[PDB]
Amino acid sequence: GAMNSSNYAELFNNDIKLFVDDTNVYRVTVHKTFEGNVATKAINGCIFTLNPKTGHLFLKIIHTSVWAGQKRLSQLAKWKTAEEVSALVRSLPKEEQPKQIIVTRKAMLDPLEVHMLDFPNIAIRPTELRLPFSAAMSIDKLSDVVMKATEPQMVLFNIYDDWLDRISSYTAFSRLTLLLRALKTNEESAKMILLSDPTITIKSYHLWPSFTDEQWITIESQMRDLILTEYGRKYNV
Amino acid sequence: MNTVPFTSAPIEVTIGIDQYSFNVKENQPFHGIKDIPIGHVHVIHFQHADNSSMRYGYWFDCRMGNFYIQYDPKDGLYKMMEERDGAKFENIVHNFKERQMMVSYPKIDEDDTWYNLTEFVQMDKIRKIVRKDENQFSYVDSSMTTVQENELSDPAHSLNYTVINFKSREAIRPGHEMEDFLDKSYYLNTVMLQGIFKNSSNYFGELQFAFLNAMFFGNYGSSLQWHAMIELICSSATVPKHMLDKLDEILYYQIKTLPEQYSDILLNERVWNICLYSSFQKNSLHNTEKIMENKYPELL
């Protein structure tokens, strides 16, 4: 069934499950042609496939070459997502394959279901949650590796850095989505908050700064305040 | 012309024969239906005055035997039975006509409606869907489930319609996932027509049988089957031109015969808007589109 605020805690049980977000698979800039018509230019994208319990992230870089000579690309992006997600499952030992795949957008249900026909016992599920995974390309290291790619490529990350050494997956995922929500709503301010202090660096094998526990509290409070300020502004409340 | 006699009418019942129907009263002198055209399948069906649930009935072909109706008070329903003694049977039929206690299959000579609803329905294919090989006729009622429905419980009483599933290995060639799901042409033409049905007339016959079951019994699973088989064609980019033209005729007469007040449960909004307006075949059902728009514009 669909995933919502009721069954939120199911993410963190010991049933393996992956989130799939396709929002950044097909990315274009829009520009004008010499004759004054509008045209798109595609840039590299990514499939964002995430295990919310372990933080492991299967970032599949989608090279602009895949669009070459293709029509109805926004439709095709969904089918390529499903194809790449299926191959990732197939590439994983059985005991690591997920029991559920939750797509962040309901339009991915049919493409994935059709591609997963070989895995009838993997349940493909929608969500009603409003997850901010589209903001992944606001994570500097993630955007960097996507934009530099010359070819299709799979890059692995732990999107929680080493947080789980000290906090639960429930807490780690609430931090991750808070940070991404903030980045989504006001990237410049979100990024300002994360980097203002030059003496808290990002480890080479990490995505976020090495905040201590107390400093994460302050940061989380600052991100909270940012999101509410921006909400007032949007709705003049 | 053929005859189906009734032993008696013990209980009040609305009797249908094909698209026609009559009210018969408890122990009214009623002894059957005469002048039934030979050359087509036929369906005699019932709805008791005391139970508007369960419509039931028997599909048959007069060329396959002498058939008659007899009420069973243990089971409480009108049963169809075959008389093997041709002499005895002409004898009963003749006496009841002499006494004029039979209704006449009331065909207008201009009207091809029943032909058009059953053109491709063969009694032999019916008997594979309703498996009960001790009888030459086939029982169907409102509550019977299909095989596909039994997969999602007594198989003896199942409607064995051909199973169609758009999200299945059968429908989707590995490697052509996107192509085969958006363009069901390979599933229709290779898997279903060439593979399973062998030709379009068997496909069509099952499509028409499905509809009539939905229509005369409110059989829900038959309604499902009918829409699936329409959907499979409309969602195929490559259909024999003779099939599209015959489909438009078939659907036209189905829509035309449907009771107006049943359009809500018997027509699936999604399938129809897809066939008529979205699918590859949006421009290929001109007669069906026109009757749907002038008779059920709300549904669209």
- Domains of chain B (ranges; CATH) run 1-143 (2.60.34.20), 144-300 (1.25.40.550)
* Residue in A with minimal Cα distance to B168: A117
C-alpha to C-alpha distance for B296 and B269, rounded to whole angstroms: 11
Q: Could you tell me the residue ranges of all domains in chain A?
A: 9-163, 164-237
Identify the H or E element spanning A45: strand A45-50
Q: Which residue of B151, B152, B172, B177 to mutate against A (max A Cβ within 10 Å)?
A: B177
Spell A49-78 as b/e; 16+ CB within 10 A means b: bbbbbebbbbbbbbbeebbeeeeeeeebbb
Contact call for A110 and B167, based on CB within 8 A: yes
> What is the experimental method?
X-ray
Best of A75, A90, A117, A122 to mutate (most B CBs within 10 Å, chain B)? A117
Specify whether the backbone of A69 is left (phi greater than 0), alpha (psi in -120 to 50) or beta.
left
Chain B: give the shortest CA distance to residue A84, in Å.
12
A230 by DSSP, 3-state: which? helix
How many pairs of residues across A and B have Cβ atoms under 8 Å apart? Answer: 21
Chain B residues lying within 8 Å of A76, measured CB to CB: 178
CB A147 within 8 A of CB A43: yes
B273, two tokens: 């808007």
Resolution in A: 1.9
* Residue A118 with chain B: CB contacts under 8 Å: 169
Q: Does A119 touch chain B (CB under 8 A)?
A: no
| A227-to-A129, B118, B227 alpha-carbon distances in Å | 17, 65, 49
Q: How far apart are CA B220 and CA B55, in angstroms?
A: 12
Task: Please give the CATH topology (third level) of the domain spanning A164-237.
Answer: Acyl-CoA Binding Protein (1.20.80)
Closest CA to A24 of A116, A104, A91, A126: A104
Q: Return the half-sphere exposure (C-beta side, CA atoms, 13 A cut-off) of residue A127.
A: 23
Closest chain A CA to residue B181: A114
Measure in Å the smallest separation between the Cα of A43 and chain B Cα atoms.
23
Residues 6+ apart with CB under 8 A from A41: A28, A29, A31
Within A71-212, where are the H helices?
73-91, 109-115, 140-148, 169-185, 187-195
Residue numbers in B near A74 (CB within 8 A): none
Pick among B181, B184, B270 to test the A interface (most A CBs inside 10 A) = B181
DSSP state of A203: P
**CA-based nearest distance A51→chain B, Å:** 26
Contact A24/A139 with Cβ under 8 angstroms?
Answer: no
A78 CA to chain B: closest CA distance, Å?
Answer: 10
Q: Which residue of B has its CA nearest to A114?
A: B167
**Which of B169, B173, B178, B183 is the best substitution to test chain A (most A C-beta atoms within 10 A)?**
B178
CB A19 within 8 A of CB A57: no
**How many Cβ atoms from other residues are within 10 Å of residue B219's Cβ?**
24
CA contacts within 13 A on the Cβ side of B141: 13
For chain A, first and last CA: distance in Å?
35
CATH number for domain A9-163, candidates 3.30.365.10, 3.50.50.60, 3.50.30.60, 3.30.420.230: 3.30.420.230
Query: What are the chain B neighbours of A83 within 8 Å (beta carbons)?
Result: 177
What is residue A3's DSSP assignment? B
Amino acid identity at B104 = S
What are B's interface residues with A at a Cβ cutoff of 8 A? 167-169, 172, 177-178, 181
The beta-carbon neighbor of B172 closest among A76, A83, A114 is A114
Please tell me the distance in Å from B201's CA to the nearest CA on chain A: 30
CA distance B203 to B164: 12
Contacts of A193 (CB under 8 A, 6+ apart): A182, A219, A222, A223, A226
A111:B172 CB<8 A: no
Residues contacting B176, CB < 8 A, separation 6+: B186
Chain A residue with CA closest to B182: the answer is A111
Residues of A in contact with B169 (CB under 8 A): 117-118
